[PDB]
Structures are given as C-alpha cells and as structure tokens.
Design a protein around this ligand. Structure first.
Ligand SMILES: *[C@@H]1O[C@H](CO)[C@@H](O[C@@H]2O[C@H](CO)[C@@H](O)[C@H](O)[C@H]2NC(C)=O)[C@H](O)[C@H]1NC(C)=O
Ligand code: NAG
Ligand code: NAG
Ligand code: NAG
Ligand code: ZN
Ligand code: ZN
Length: 411
C-alpha cells in the first residue's frame, strides 16, 4: 500500500519552560497556573518545542514507509494579538518548516495555512501579503511556479505529488471563510478561490488525476455545538456544492483546526454518500481554564491504493501526555487502526456511511469508542448524553445546512 502522514495544529509556544511559578511556565496559559506541567507540555499550555520534535522524531523512526506528508496549519501559539507580530508569526512558521525540512530532506510536504498563521490571527487577506510571500519562499522546495504564484496571492495552491503520478493535492485557504475573518465579510468569492478551485478540479478531471483536498478549517458543522458550521454557512454551502459536483475526482478530504478526531461523510440531498472527510487532532494539548476536556497530542497516517488513491486505512498515533510528563520520556504509540477499531473494509464513503448508521443506534459500542477517540483518549470516562450524541451523529452525517437541520429535528 502507499502511505502518507498528516500533522496539524502544532502551535509551538517558544516560551515554554518548567519553573516553580506555574503562571510563568508558558505565555499561552495567559497567567493561569499550568495545571501539572512537564517537559512535554501542560493542558493549559501550547506545545513545547520538545513535544513537536518528539512527534516528528517518532514519525522519522516509526519504521513506516510514507511517500509524502500533509500539514494543515496553525503553528504560532494561543497568545493575545499584541504579544505577536508579523515577524514573530513568520519566525515560528519558519521554525516548524525548517524542523520538517531538516528531519525529512527528501519528503514532499503539502502545507496549508491556519487561522493563526497570520498577524493578527484570523485576518488572512484576499490579496498578497508579507506572510503569503514568506510562506511561498519557505515552501518552495515542495511547490512549483504556479502553486507559488497562487500561494503568494491568496494562500492556496494545488500541486502534483512527485512520488505518486496521477495524484494532485489542492491546499485551500479556508480561513478566508472563517467567521472571525473580518477581511472577507460579504465577499461572494474571496481571493477568487471558488473559481480557481472549479478550474483546478476541471483540469484534474481531464488530466485523469485524483485529488486530495487539504485545508485548515473544515467544512460541515462543529459536532459539539448546535447549528454552528465551522466556516460561515454561505461559504460552507458553496464549497460543498463544488465538492459534491466533483466527488468522483476527489478521493479524500483532510482538515485540522478543531483539535479533535472526527469523521464526516459528505452526502447529497437524498442521502447518497459521496466523499469521505477526515479531521485530525492537534499536536498541541492546549485548553482554556473552564473547558472540561482536551486532546492528547496526535499524529496520523493514511494508507491508500498505489496508482489508484482510494483510501484503505488510517492509523492514529498519540502521546499519552500524563504518562510522558510523569516519567520524562515520550512513548508515541498506536491509538487505533480505523478498519480494525470499527470493523469496516476501508475508508470509502459507503463504509463510513454504514458505520455512522451503526453509531446512531442506541447504546452503540462503536459510538462510545468513537467519542473516546474524539479526545484522542484523553478521558476514558467521558460521557456523551443523548443531546451530545445527536449533535455528534448529525454533524458526522450531515454537512449541509438543510440535511443537518432535518437530522436535528428527527433526533
Ligand atoms: C495515560 O496514562 C495515565 C498515567 O499512567 C493513565 O492514568 C492512570 O490510570 C490508572 C488506571 O485507571 C489510574 O489508577 C491512575 O491513577 C492514572 N494515573 C494518573 C496520573 O492519572 C491513563 O489511563 C492513560 N491513558 C490511556 C488512554 O490509557
Ligand atoms: C498559582 O498557584 C500558587 C500555588 O497554589 C498560588 O499561590 C497562586 O495564587 C496561583 N495563581 C493563580 C493565578 O492561580
Ligand atoms: C526552533 O525553536 C527551538 C526553541 O524555540 C530551537 O531550539 C530550535 O533550534 C529552532 N529550530 C530552528 C530550525 O530554528
Ligand atoms: C475543462 O478542461 C478542458 C480541458 O483542458 C477545457 O477544454 C475546458 O474548457 C475546461 N472547462 C472549463 C469549464 O473550464
Ligand atoms: Zn489550532
Ligand atoms: Zn485553527
């Protein structure tokens, strides 16, 4: 089989350091006491360099063959806008990029921008910018002239996969659609990314290519909230229309941003499953003071059919953070293999559609496991009551506003 890695939401905090006063352990805790801080982080902190390095070192030494890597954004830490600048955002993205290029000199990597990959965060523009030009320079080892040109103009590109003839990655800037982006209010096609996307998918159709979509913020609804799409509804609906129309050319969709392990299945209006969607959890374990749950750090690997690119499996790895901070050594380890955790043949939409139908049945053992894996096994005693379960299952199965509302009405 072929394989590729997916990492996301690294969120390096360069200030992390163990010290007696736990309000000074990390600037990303914003003056709150780090809860139980160790060398690999704290649930109230973003990622120490040591954690990010241990993730990439695990990947390097895993014994897993992989022909490329996708990397879907958010490298600066969660600190207030005035504590960052354009220069600091670039410096952190540069550090992450150079860590990857130093450790994996021969591995093509396909990055996407996250909402924090800009100063101020979330305000990614629809014209060229310092950050777009800087990441064009940084990612030039992996990208050709046309990809570099679109990246500098609007933060998006497509690129052939050198090691996989007939495969093309489309890296969208979905931060252009993200609610907090005040640079794009009421634009029908910001940075002309929809037109471009349609043009690109058309060319892949006629060049007999398969396409993997990557982006930071995903399509669909947030599974912990009621009727809250991850990007603005207008843009979610327009993007999903493109994806449905081209669902025979797109062989997978891969997102980050939510810092959780989630599945979605894009269907049409009449319940026919069309395309599979995978949201990967973060390397950072950070959470706010009030939140009950967070994720363990995660990285994941996809297996696909050579020369075909049908998705065959997904292996999710994780770092048990409490364990690693208690002994001072990481033990990145397999959390689950999707086919064998869920007893499904593969990652095709039919397989995942049937699995979600299983999730919806009462006391489903599969949904209980899924919900535990949602937080990357942070809390094995975590409960999802009927309202919580309806929100998760409806967001998994229904990406568009109409079918999602239908789903909630019936549940
Ligand atoms: C991650 O590691 C921690 C630490 O070993 C595990 O938590 C321990 O679980 C045992 C068994 O229930 C408890 O008796 C200990 O009190 C726990 N230790 C701490 C420090 O909380 C945890 O179960 C591991 N996570 C997973 C998913 O296995
Ligand atoms: C942090 O913890 C110390 C030790 O308990 C305490 O004295 C201090 O007030 C705490 N500060 C905050 C902001 O919680
Ligand atoms: C990234 O930052 C860490 C600490 O902030 C430093 O130790 C490391 O050398 C940096 N890496 C690069 C490639 O600049
Ligand atoms: C799609 O691609 C073909 C082949 O390159 C081209 O002839 C055609 O004009 C394109 N159609 C659109 C709508 O862009
Ligand atoms: Zn993030
Ligand atoms: Zn984000």
């Amino acid at each position: 089989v072929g394989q590729f890695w997916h990492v996301t939401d690294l969120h390096l905090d360069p200030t992390y350091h163990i010290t007696d006063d736990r309000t000074k352990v990390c600037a990303s805790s914003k003056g709150a006491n780090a809860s139980n801080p160790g060398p690999f982080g704290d649930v109230l902190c973003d990622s120490p360099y040591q954690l990010i390095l241990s993730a990439f070192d695990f990947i390097k030494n895993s014994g897993q063959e992989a022909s490329f890597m996708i990397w879907t954004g958010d490298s600066p830490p969660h600190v207030p806008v005035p504590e960052l600048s354009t220069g600091t955002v670039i410096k952190v993205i540069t550090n992450m990029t150079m860590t990857v290029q130093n450790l994996f000199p021969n591995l093509q990597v396909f990055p996407a921008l996250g909402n924090h990959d800009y100063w101020p965060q979330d305000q990614l523009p629809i014209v060229t910018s310092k950050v777009y030009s800087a990441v064009a320079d940084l990612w030039k080892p992996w990208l050709g002239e046309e990809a570099i040109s679109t990246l500098k103009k609007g933060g998006f590109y497509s690129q052939k996969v050198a090691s996989n003839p007939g495969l093309r990655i489309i890296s969208l800037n979905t931060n252009l659609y993200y609610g907090p982006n005040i640079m794009t209010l009421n634009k029908t096609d910001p940075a002309n990314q929809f037109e471009w996307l349609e043009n690109t998918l058309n060319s892949s159709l006629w060049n007999k290519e398969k396409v993997y979509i990557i982006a930071h913020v995903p399509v669909g609804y947030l599974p912990y909230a009621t009727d809250t799409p991850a990007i603005r509804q207008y843009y979610n609906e327009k993007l999903l229309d493109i994806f449905r129309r081209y669902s025979s050319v797109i062989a997978g969709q891969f997102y980050g941003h939510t810092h959780r392990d989630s599945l979605m299945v894009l269907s049409d209006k009449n319940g026919n499953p069309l395309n599979s969607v995978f949201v990967a959890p973060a390397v950072t374990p950070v959470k706010g003071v009030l939140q009950k749950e967070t994720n363990n750090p995660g990285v994941r690997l996809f297996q696909y059919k050579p020369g075909d690119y049908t998705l065959l499996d997904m292996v999710q790895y994780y770092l048990n953070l409490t364990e690693a901070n208690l002994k001072g050594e990481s033990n990145w380890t397999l959390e689950y293999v999707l086919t064998q955790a869920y007893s499904v043949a593969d990652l095709q939409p039919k397989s995942l559609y049937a699995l979600v139908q299983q999730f919806a049945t009462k006391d489903s053992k599969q949904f209980l496991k899924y919900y535990h894996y949602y937080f990357v096994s942070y809390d094995s005693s975590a409960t999802c009551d009927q309202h919580c379960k309806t929100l998760q299952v409806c967001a998994i199965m229904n990406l568009d506003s109409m079918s999602y509302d239908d789903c909630l009405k019936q549940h």
